[PDB]
């Protein structure tokens, strides 16, 4: 009741005690890189409906797309062809996944089931949730850090279909997650304006960051392991930390009203892409909110985004069945 | 080599694009529905109805309801203060950004439940009510035609010619004869003809 209202004030005093300066003040440094732009180098016109989420492969070529038409097309970003075209049980999928060994593709959406495919037939249908799924990632070839909408990030085992650790307790719908480069801890943005980093080893919360005013759509992670950025439905992309526990910047302009749909960093972390909702996707510079390119294109949405393992060419999805590759 | 690798995938690029175009003539002929408050497929005179459902998902609908923005008709089944909490749902589907161009079908519930309990108004503008005609009793048709007027009181303030409400009073032939009216009135508003 009232016995826990004073313990939170010990954190708000401590998190403001470590606020020595700002990123906006200590970056009196070299100039921004000017207006950058990218032209659509490919166009993967194969789908029939909206692309809700894709995932660029670990091979830096073979991306996997997942649309609401029932298709899971394992594309090819080099010869534009289609290596496979996997049909699905239920017509909706909201996320797809790619193993780092390049030999597994996981996909599953509003049908409450994370299915496992091996690049054509099913392998294991890891049911057990009581909500829609929102993001699936691979740790190794037998372990996935799934999200849900039932307030619970889980961790299945593809051998014998068991839930090893249930990262429970978020008081709201969970949305897209990410993964550290060390693959031992993962953040989870959710519909409570709270990006709560968990821990795979222990199996509970390690921190909890709150800097948003509305629900969180998608999230990313920094390419070293000491930060992560988060986009929400109020046209903002806040950049948090892990050793200072406070947000540093807020990437927002005056005119933008539409909410963020997907966020992913570059290879060196300097360029923070952001898939907006007003039919384009900006390129925010991570040390100063310069907005160094409008990067137009699609005419319905920018529903998902993803950068390669080598940082070569991003792949903004859409809601009119067109992927585009930008280098 | 560099001559068999290009033919390694072009035999798979042209065995798949000859299959997707044989599946494109099935997705284009399936009409998606949504029985808003587990899939089912029925047909009526050789057209495929891909009626969805939401039964297992929780009661917080703001992120699996923008996943249904290509559906042609949201079957908004409602009952006859249960109405007021089930009208702000319809108030929010209408004024939404992604479900804006989706013409809602509305099914009021069993009319004997509004006929047994009258022989309880919960609204201020129910006493001064001038009832319309073409019903059956005047003590029942004055009550049934109020929520059928209240649900249509919002549907004309943001109609804009794109999406209308098509209220009924309860059967697959009554959706087939109304899903045709959605397709005809969609093709007519783009011709600058309606």
């Amino acid at each position, epitope marked *: 009741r009232q016995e826990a209202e004073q313990l939170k004030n010990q954190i708000r005093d401590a998190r403001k005690a470590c606020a020595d300066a700002t990123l906006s003040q200590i970056t009196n440094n070299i100039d921004p890189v000017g207006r950058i732009q990218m032209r659509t180098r490919r166009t993967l016109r194969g789908h029939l409906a909206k692309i809700y989420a894709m995932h660029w492969g670990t091979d830096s070529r073979l991306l996997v797309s997942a649309s609401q038409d029932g298709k899971l097309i394992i594309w090819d970003s080099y010869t534009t062809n289609k290596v496979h075209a996997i049909p699905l049980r239920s017509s909706w999928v909201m996320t797809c996944a790619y193993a780092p060994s390049g030999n597994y593709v996981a996909c599953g959406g509003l049908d409450n089931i994370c299915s496992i495919y091996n690049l054509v037939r099913v392998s294991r249908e890891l049911a057990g949730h009581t909500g829609y799924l929102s993001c699936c990632r691979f740790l190794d070839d037998n372990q996935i850090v799934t999200s849900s909408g039932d307030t619970t990030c889980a961790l299945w085992d593809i051998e014998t279909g068991q839930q090893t650790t249930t990262f429970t307790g978020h*008081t*709201g*719908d969970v949305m897209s997650l990410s993964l550290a480069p060390d693959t031992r801890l993962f953040v989870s943005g959710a*519909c*409570d*304006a*709270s990006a709560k980093l968990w821990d795979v080893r222990e199996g509970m919360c390690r921190q909890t960051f*709150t800097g948003h*005013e*509305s*629900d969180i759509n998608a999230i990313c992670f920094f390419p070293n392991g000491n930060a992560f950025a988060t986009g929400s*439905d*109020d*046209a903002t992309c806040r950049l948090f930390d892990l050793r200072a526990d406070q947000e540093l910047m807020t990437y927002s302009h005056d005119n933008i*009203i539409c*909410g963020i749909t997907s966020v992913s960093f570059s290879k060196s972390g300097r360029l923070l892409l952001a898939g907006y909702d007003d039919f384009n996707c900006n390129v925010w510079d991570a040390l100063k909110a310069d907005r160094a390119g409008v990067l137009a294109g699609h005419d319905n949405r920018v529903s998902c985004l993803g950068v390669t393992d080598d940082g070569m060419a991003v792949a903004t999805g859409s809601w009119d069945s067109f992927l585009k590759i930008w280098n | 080599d560099q001559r068999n690798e290009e033919k390694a995938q072009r035999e798979a690029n042209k065995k798949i694009e000859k299959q997707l175009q044989k599946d494109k003539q099935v997705y284009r002929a399936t009409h998606r529905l949504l029985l808003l408050g587990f899939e089912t497929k029925f047909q009526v005179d050789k057209v495929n109805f891909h009626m969805f459902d939401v039964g297992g998902q*929780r*009661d*917080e*609908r*703001r992120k699996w309801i923008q996943c249904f923005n290509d559906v042609t008709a949201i079957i908004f089944v409602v009952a006859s*203060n249960r109405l*007021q*909490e089930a009208l*702000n*749902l319809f*108030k*929010s*589907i209408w*004024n*939404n*950004r992604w479900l804006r161009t989706i013409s809602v079908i509305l099914f009021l519930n069993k009319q004997d439940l509004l006929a047994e309990k009258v022989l309880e108004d*919960y*609204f*201020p503008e129910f006493a001064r009510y001038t009832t319309p005609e073409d019903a059956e009793d005047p003590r029942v048709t004055r009550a049934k035609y109020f929520i059928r007027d209240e649900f249509l009181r919002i549907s004309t303030a943001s109609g804009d010619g794109r999406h209308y409400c098509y209220p009924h009073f309860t059967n697959i032939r009554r959706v087939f004869n109304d899903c045709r009216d959605i397709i005809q009135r969609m093709h007519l508003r783009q011709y600058e003809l309606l």
Partner: nanobody
Amino acid sequence: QVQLQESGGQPGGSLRLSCAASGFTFSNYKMNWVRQAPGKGLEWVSDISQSGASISYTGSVKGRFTISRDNAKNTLYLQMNSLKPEDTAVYYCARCPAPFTRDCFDVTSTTYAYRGQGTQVTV
């Protein structure tokens, strides 16, 4: 964070309920009150638009009460003129989950928790 505190308190008297909004911008949020009598589920009571235009109500609390947001002190006020014995309810000050919209899904169950309790009003 998003702190929604509440304040304020014989059938037929009067009551005035005040709140706060610390953490977000208050100029562009479609705030609304939601009450729940004990034993039953949550109902709807009122609404306030982004400027003070579309002041809606429910069926039974129509005309009696009067609500106006301030938009200068991050506060909205629910003036309860001519109260009733059927208003024995706890009054949660809800929130509209997206800036610059005209829809609200803020009626349902306990899927939001980071908010003050809301004062208990009995008759």
